[PDB]
RNA sequence: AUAAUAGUAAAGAUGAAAUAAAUAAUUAUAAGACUAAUAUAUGUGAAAAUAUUAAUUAAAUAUUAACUGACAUUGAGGGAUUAAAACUAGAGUAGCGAAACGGAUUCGAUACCCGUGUAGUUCUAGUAGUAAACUAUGAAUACAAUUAUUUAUAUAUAUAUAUAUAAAUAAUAAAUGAAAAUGAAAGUAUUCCACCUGAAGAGUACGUUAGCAAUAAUGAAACUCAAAACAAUAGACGG
């Protein structure tokens, strides 16, 4: 009956492509009065709690730390960008609830992010991380890719 | 026949195709 | 029932890079422990005294100790010696 | 230390006969090398004689032959006959299309 | 021809989970018996969680009541039943697979045949001679 | 209602993808190693790379044929090496 | 500006067919775009060597030769100037007809038709907007 | 692709670059095309082809029993089917992508790389009958020495193997061959069809036939030359 938005967990998503690394920190917000609403079916309640809304808090790329052009897709650019994210999560008091890490692709920044989170740079965030997962998107047939490059 | 020998036929076919395209073009202007 | 795969006749039976068991250096493991001992109890802590004494003796004359475990694999000698006998080739 | 890793010690079953070699490291290594899932046949429905296509509405049994992501396992891993592998794959694909797997 | 229908009905009311399934089985059963068809068996499979969230008629679902219906009908009637199931909002997923009767006239449901019971007589004779 | 509140835990994990690991709060680097093993046992990195550029069906078929042969060839090679080792052990 | 400058090879022994078919087209097309062009003339042996540009960096006068040689060499320069007449300004020849020479052509006055890329982007935007309009109609029919 | 949401200032691309309230993230909607694992194209199909699911119709296996009683093989002409591209109409058009216009690279770059991307790629109804349409190997029958591995059928039991008879595949003996190799044929024989007679000219010219068209089929001669080609050998060289 009253909006009671509360954070349930945080999602640390990393997209590691060939030319850049994108790191997004989000909050899974849950209106704790949703079940108190009128005209709400058992299915709508279960469907609302199975995919809770998300709000973006921190969005970073390798170009936000001053890496330009070809340097954006390198191991060092990702390692420093991961550090800046782990710092901004502590400077915003967003290290109270559990964090779920979602990795998307297999570029050069995937192993830098993992190294920065299992090392000194991520000794605070790692303590809250509860689940790691992979979200690489594959196609079963799907659209035709571009032709092979003759180099 | 080997690729080497096939290449001679390839050149002859290319020149015939090139000549027929050229003839076509003329017919269009002359038509 | 387990599918047996039979090779065609081959010019050779050879392992490109035969694997060998290389025992770890005793002095390096001692150094890896002492370094860890200092990481927990602190540098020069009295708890790592024995480690320091052992490390000094291991490296006193040679920093890697008496390395006398060099080995080479004999699989390629036997493989070439026995291939004609065990390949199951039909008679001429 | 009064403790040894389980991988470095062999536990001789009860009622079995042993030789002095059974206390050596060679036995440990030999048991690892020749460690195959041969007891699957007696626990493998698809290696018993049933038709795998009769299990297209039983996702729990079919989920034993797919990886964590649902990828059908190659015959080299399942150890099934050509016919059963062919029938099992059809069952899984039909199960996926029905909305059960 | 003998056919095996597997339908995933929607569970709208958590209080009456097996309500739309009963209403649907009656609708399908009536079509079969009113068009020269025979209904051999109706095996409920219970409420199960769907492998994923599925959609139907601009609605989403996370669970469904599974049920099997072994029936005998003509090909034309079988297509009519499938068409009605593909249109009913209650049905989330429906599949009809033919059960070959070339070698024997009495075949049990795939679920039962998977358990070793090949005919309905074997199932009935295990409920009378031993029950 | 609460019926839709107390049955969300299983429901949440009932629709799993199989690409998730529960982190070991003690050794968090062992959980990332487990996740990498899943990726390699489902060929996720390989499939992604193979989907970047289109390959003609004929070329795809050739590559699939050659790969199978190399896989089968290696199994036949290992079978022959095992025979060599067994023969050597018995003095042949 | 180095992009505007395009280096070209015109050997002294070139045939007036290649000179008036390939080289003429190359020079004329480049000049029409607005790219500067420097034409380097030299003997076939040294002109086209690995040190194509490097040898010309090397740039007692060269001795005279049979007039036939200079009839060819001077004829080439006449053809070059006549070919590049309305497409560029007067040339700055820097060398001797008895040796290497660097003709330095410069594009003639040409206004900037830079408003072409504006149309390009506008057309792309128009197509995208038309696609959206079409997709709205699909959603409407689906709803209806 | 669009919209919303918070959240920002770069993003995207490349060998490196540059051309054209975002990117990323979480939702919702729409559209077209495609079909991950299994998977070996194994198998099936005359070939071309054929691997997401179900159904309908058609065809396809082995053995046994009975029946017909040479009714067979091959096959000029003929007929049917036939990848991709292309073409004629009507739809569709996400992604890909000749061309075109741009950005780079380069001594130059009418290319390789990048962008925007039209035809085409998709479906329906047709035209056309061409591919390294290849196993570069027409079809059928009789026959000849072995092994291994699967598959199928059958038999037996001291119930899970064992013993048989076929098929397939792999490696071979003999034989054949210019050799490379073939291996149940490229062997020993028989029957029928197609095709070839130095290179180049030329699958061209002309004519004819067919097609909306692109084209497809048929298919020469003159002049010139003493060449031209295959397998294998030893070298030299290889970004
Ligand atoms: K095949
Ligand atoms: K007779
Ligand atoms: K006849
Ligand atoms: K004929
Ligand atoms: K299109
Ligand atoms: K024939
Ligand atoms: Mg890079
Ligand atoms: Mg493109
Ligand atoms: Mg020939
Ligand atoms: Mg986006
Ligand atoms: Mg597939
Ligand atoms: Mg085959
Ligand atoms: Mg015939
Ligand atoms: Mg094809
Ligand atoms: Mg059209
Ligand atoms: Mg261009
Ligand atoms: Mg240019
Ligand atoms: Mg392009
Ligand atoms: Mg036709
Ligand atoms: Mg042709
Ligand atoms: Mg032909
Ligand atoms: Mg083909
Ligand atoms: Mg026949
Ligand atoms: Mg012709
Ligand atoms: Mg040769």
Swiss-Prot record, chain A:
Location of the protein in the cell: Mitochondrion
Recorded GO CC terms: mitochondrial inner membrane; mitochondrial small ribosomal subunit; mitochondrion
Keyword line: Mitochondrion, Ribonucleoprotein, Ribosomal protein, Transit peptide
A molecular function GO annotation: structural constituent of ribosome
GO BP annotations, alphabetical order: mitochondrial translation; translation
Family: Belongs to the universal ribosomal protein uS11 family.
Subunit organization: Component of the mitochondrial small ribosomal subunit (mt-SSU). Mature yeast 74S mitochondrial ribosomes consist of a small (37S) and a large (54S) subunit. The 37S small subunit contains a 15S ribosomal RNA (15S mt-rRNA) and 34 different proteins. The 54S large subunit contains a 21S rRNA (21S mt-rRNA) and 46 different proteins.
Note: Present with 5300 molecules/cell in log phase SD medium.
Function: Component of the mitochondrial ribosome (mitoribosome), a dedicated translation machinery responsible for the synthesis of mitochondrial genome-encoded proteins, including at least some of the essential transmembrane subunits of the mitochondrial respiratory chain. The mitoribosomes are attached to the mitochondrial inner membrane and translation products are cotranslationally integrated into the membrane.
Protein name: Small ribosomal subunit protein uS11m
Organism per entry: Saccharomyces cerevisiae (strain ATCC 204508 / S288c)
Gene name as annotated: MRPS18
Residue range from the parent sequence: 67 to 217 of 217
UniProtKB/Swiss-Prot annotation, chain B:
Gene name, Swiss-Prot/TrEMBL: QRI5
Biased composition (Basic residues): 5-22
Homology family: Belongs to the mitochondrion-specific ribosomal protein mS38 family.
The name this protein goes by in its record: Small ribosomal subunit protein mS38
Region (Disordered) location: 5-31
Free-text function comment from the UniProt entry: Component of the mitochondrial ribosome (mitoribosome), a dedicated translation machinery responsible for the synthesis of mitochondrial genome-encoded proteins, including at least some of the essential transmembrane subunits of the mitochondrial respiratory chain. The mitoribosomes are attached to the mitochondrial inner membrane and translation products are cotranslationally integrated into the membrane. mS38 is also involved in the splicing of the COX1 mRNA.
Top-level taxon of origin: Eukaryota
Compartment list: Mitochondrion; Mitochondrion inner membrane
Assembly mode: Component of the mitochondrial small ribosomal subunit (mt-SSU). Mature yeast 74S mitochondrial ribosomes consist of a small (37S) and a large (54S) subunit. The 37S small subunit contains a 15S ribosomal RNA (15S mt-rRNA) and 34 different proteins. The 54S large subunit contains a 21S rRNA (21S mt-rRNA) and 46 different proteins.
Organism: Saccharomyces cerevisiae (strain ATCC 204508 / S288c) (Baker's yeast)
Compositional bias segments (type: Basic and acidic residues): 23-31
Swiss-Prot record, chain E:
Protein's GO biological process: mitochondrial translation
GO cellular component: mitochondrial inner membrane; mitochondrial small ribosomal subunit; mitochondrion
Top-rank taxon: Eukaryota
GO molecular function annotation: small ribosomal subunit rRNA binding; structural constituent of ribosome
Keywords from the named record: Mitochondrion, Ribonucleoprotein, Ribosomal protein
Primary subcellular site in the record, as a coarse category: mitochondrion
Subcellular location as annotated: Mitochondrion
Record-stated family: Belongs to the bacterial ribosomal protein bS6 family.
Record text on subunit structure and interactions: Component of the mitochondrial small ribosomal subunit (mt-SSU). Mature yeast 74S mitochondrial ribosomes consist of a small (37S) and a large (54S) subunit. The 37S small subunit contains a 15S ribosomal RNA (15S mt-rRNA) and 34 different proteins. The 54S large subunit contains a 21S rRNA (21S mt-rRNA) and 46 different proteins.
PANTHER family, alphabetized: MITOCHONDRIAL 28S RIBOSOMAL PROTEIN S6 (PTHR21011), SMALL RIBOSOMAL SUBUNIT PROTEIN BS6M (PTHR21011:SF1)
Function: Component of the mitochondrial ribosome (mitoribosome), a dedicated translation machinery responsible for the synthesis of mitochondrial genome-encoded proteins, including at least some of the essential transmembrane subunits of the mitochondrial respiratory chain. The mitoribosomes are attached to the mitochondrial inner membrane and translation products are cotranslationally integrated into the membrane.
Protein name, as recorded: Small ribosomal subunit protein bS6m
UniProtKB/Swiss-Prot annotation, chain G:
Subcellular locations according to the entry: Mitochondrion
Disruption phenotype: Increases frequency of mitochondrial genome loss.
Entry coiled-coil feature ranges: none
Domain of life: Eukaryota
Family to which this protein belongs: Belongs to the AIM23 family.
More about this protein: Present with 319 molecules/cell in log phase SD medium.
UniProt protein name: Altered inheritance of mitochondria protein 23, mitochondrial
The organism of origin for this protein: Saccharomyces cerevisiae (strain ATCC 204508 / S288c) (Baker's yeast)
Gene assigned in the entry: AIM23
Residue window of the full protein shown: 208 to 356 of 356
